[PDB]
Structure 1
Amino acid sequence: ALSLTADQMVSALLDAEPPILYSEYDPTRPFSMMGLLTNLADRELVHMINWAKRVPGFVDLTLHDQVHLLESAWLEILMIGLVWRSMEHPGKLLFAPNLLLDRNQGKSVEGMVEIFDMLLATSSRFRMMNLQGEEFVCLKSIILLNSGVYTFTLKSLEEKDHIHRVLDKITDTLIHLMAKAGLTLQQQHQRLAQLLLILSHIRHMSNKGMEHLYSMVPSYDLLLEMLD
């Protein structure tokens, strides 16, 4: 994992990409939103576990640490996936190819339109930056490794060190992608910063989303069971 080249890292992440799932509803029947979104999120989680195990360095960690990282990051990962899927659909959120929802549709649940608006704005930011697929997969892997790394013994110190080393490799990779695309050294650092700063907003969105869900979520046990 730490011996991978930038090109190899990118290829590994692109290969690890999960599929785009569909919403489960009878399309011949008349058009609950939260039920549809929950069932979709449930099914995506399984594929996210598989994806996570294919992110270089991730399976080198202890099971306990893998669970902690996924516990911290899962909603951020679903959200960045959603925002990426929605990028070329101004004003809409592509939850699934058969479930493309606008802001007005979000108003059907109390507190939801606020979250829809933040996701739509992130998609807008992605569009304005012209985010590339190779950059997106790097960012999603960064979320997985970074979100829980500040909230964790000699083994723990080794785990955190490894995580930072893998994150450094992904940073190198992002820069390499920007250098290959022809950006100047200045533009490279600037774009790196712009991309990483969006991750703070994705964290914010996830926290707001978790508040919504807790006001009504995969347990440590379910995640542990799925990862073990």
Structure 2
Amino acid sequence: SLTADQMVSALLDAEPPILYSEYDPPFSEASMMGLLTNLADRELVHMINWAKRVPGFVDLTLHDQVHLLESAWLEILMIGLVWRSMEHPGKLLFAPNLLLDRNQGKSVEGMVEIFDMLLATSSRFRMMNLQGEEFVCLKSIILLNSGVYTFTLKSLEEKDHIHRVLDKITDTLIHLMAKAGLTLQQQHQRLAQLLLILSHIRHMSNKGMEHLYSMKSKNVVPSYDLLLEMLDAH
């Protein structure tokens, strides 16, 4: 029932904070993955808070909320990272005090390939002059769309709802571009350009998941119970 303007405002007010890496006056290659894992894990907690504020998300069953976050969490971490890296050519701003380049990526086997994809996405944002309002729409779309093709009377109802919210976010993107002064043709073209970036983000998440698993740590994905517990508040 939200208007396009109300949708934008809701999403902007929902934005999580930018977190820091630990301070101690040197950085070492050996400690890099530990610092990244620590940031990712802290970002996840804020991500769950954020998701619950995306219009229509808490209308879903807790089960389906968990499934959507299971599907989307790394994509959401990535698009967040690319967004805060956009103004820093050649670098990934994991935190304001953890700004990393390609060569630092090389220290971890298999990492530079994923760094390069992320850097390429940052460059594409930059060449498109992606706006914050557009970014928060894209991030919401990822949340709602990434797990929807892999979820029953209840579920049919859930899927219809998700599609209706996704349509509203399309309307919102178009509203933003119209107010930005784009022609109808430029509006459709840019809508398309933005949504095609989501294919690349999905690609990066799958490649990244492969990479994280290859590292042989104790776990990679947030468990159902963990997501549930964070989501399943009293």
TM-score, normalisation: structure 1:
0.97
Q: Which moved more, 1:18-27 or 1:134-143?
A: 18-27
Deviations 1:82-117 (A, max 9, x none): 000000000000000000001000000000000000
**What CA distance in whole angstroms lies between the structure 2 residues aligned with 1:163 and 1:67?**
14
**What CA distance in whole angstroms lies between the structure 2 residues aligned with 1:147 and 1:215?**
23
May I ask how many residue pairs the two structures share in their alignment? 224
Question: What's the secondary structure of 2:24's corresponding residue?
Answer: coil
Deviations 1:166-188 (A, max 9, x none): 00000000000000000000000
Instruction: For structure 1, list consecutive stretches of 5 or more residues without a partner in the other structure.
Output: none
**What CA distance in whole angstroms lies between the structure 2 residues aligned with 1:153 and 1:66?**
15
**What CA distance in whole angstroms lies between the structure 2 residues aligned with 1:172 and 1:148?**
21
**What CA distance in whole angstroms lies between the structure 2 residues aligned with 1:40 and 1:129?**
28
Q: What is residue 92 of structure 1 aligned with on the other side?
A: 91
**What CA distance in whole angstroms lies between the structure 2 residues aligned with 1:14 and 1:207?**
27
How far the C-alpha of 1:215 sits from its partner, in A, is 1.5
How far the C-alpha of 1:220 sits from its partner, in A, is 1.1
How far the C-alpha of 1:23 sits from its partner, in A, is 1.0
Q: What is residue 229 of structure 2 aligned with on the other side?
A: 225
**What CA distance in whole angstroms lies between the structure 1 residues aligned with 2:209 and 2:37?**
13
**What CA distance in whole angstroms lies between the structure 1 residues aligned with 2:152 and 2:111?**
41
Q: Does the 8 Å contact 1:24/1:40 carry over to 2?
A: no
Taking only the aligned residue pairs, the percentage that are identical comes to 100
Q: What is residue 51 of structure 1 aligned with on the other side?
A: 50
How far the C-alpha of 1:213 sits from its partner, in A, is 1.2
How far the C-alpha of 1:6 sits from its partner, in A, is 0.2
What value does the CA root-mean-square deviation take over the aligned residues?
0.6
Question: What's the secondary structure of 2:175's corresponding residue?
Answer: helix
Question: What's the secondary structure of 2:77's corresponding residue?
Answer: helix
How far the C-alpha of 1:225 sits from its partner, in A, is 1.0
How far the C-alpha of 1:24 sits from its partner, in A, is 2.3
**What CA distance in whole angstroms lies between the structure 1 residues aligned with 2:121 and 2:165?**
26
Q: What is residue 35 of structure 1 aligned with on the other side?
A: 34
How far the C-alpha of 1:26 sits from its partner, in A, is 2.2
